[PDB]
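Hi,

Apologies if this is the wrong queue. I'm a grad student, and the batch job for Heat shock protein 104 from Saccharomyces cerevisiae produced an output file that my downstream script rejects. I'm not sure whether the problem is my script or the file. Here is the sequence I used:
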Amino acid sequence: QTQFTERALTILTLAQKLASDHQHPQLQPIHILAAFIETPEDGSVPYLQNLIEKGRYDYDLFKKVVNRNLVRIPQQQPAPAEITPSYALGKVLQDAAKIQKQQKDSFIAQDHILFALFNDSSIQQIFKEAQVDIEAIKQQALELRGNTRIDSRGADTNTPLEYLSKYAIDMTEQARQGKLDPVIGREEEIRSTIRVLARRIKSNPCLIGEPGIGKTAIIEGVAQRIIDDDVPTILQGAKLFSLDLAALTAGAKYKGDFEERFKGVLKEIEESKTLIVLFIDEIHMLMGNGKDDAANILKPALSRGQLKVIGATTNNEYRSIVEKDGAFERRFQKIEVAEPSVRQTVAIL
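Support response: The file is valid. Your script probably expects a header line. Output copied below for reference.
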């Protein structure tokens, strides 16, 4: 007694509606495929379009082939009120159920219907006529969700986050689960970091000091201050991600791979409806040492306003960046982070 997901039910609903508009006797796999290439109600990217476009195929050609093959189906003269499923479609629904149990999922989703679709010879010649490798789209569907199982009725989102999951860590959700420890003696420097983020000019703080001094403790303090809603109006409901440069580097063995991954992370941020503050440790390994390509990706994104960045570097390394990039100095506010022994002495003097 398995149940469908909300998006899977929408596909079967659109397929039932498309067969009714074309007045076709029975529901066929071509209808479900036509429901996949259908533009969603909210203008979001369809699930199948993302797989095909990221596979670097011509999606417009694919739509044109599916439509001309569906119009090729003759229209019955008197439209009945009973659109039964065909024998070919019955196997698809039965095949999607075993695909769900094969992957140990709790619900039948778009993926399972799409996988069971790939087995029908009707849609197999559709992909061949559209010159789209059907086995490459299958690989795209496998890599998409990763290894996260489908537990809820709405776990099969069309375009899940691919770059923010591989090369970033959500510090906010990690703070909700009590995986962080509040370090003492740094609330004054946390207050300054949040004050800069609420600003509209130079809204990107940059922590200055030697690594391992408590910089990571300040970021974890800002995250837990966003969770309990102790932040100004602008930061209410904002997620705090941490860019993993080691993950960006591992596997990038081709020229431009690092920039492509970094551009993909920023793209998922700028399209997010909620404001996202990205923390970049050792930011000099991005904006300095003659790395102009990475700088030309972050600087325009900061101007659009959707992204706020918390940088972290040493004093001499920050001065090295500013000495050859005035535009960087006008977007980042300097915040000095000293060792507790030095922080206590300065306050006494």
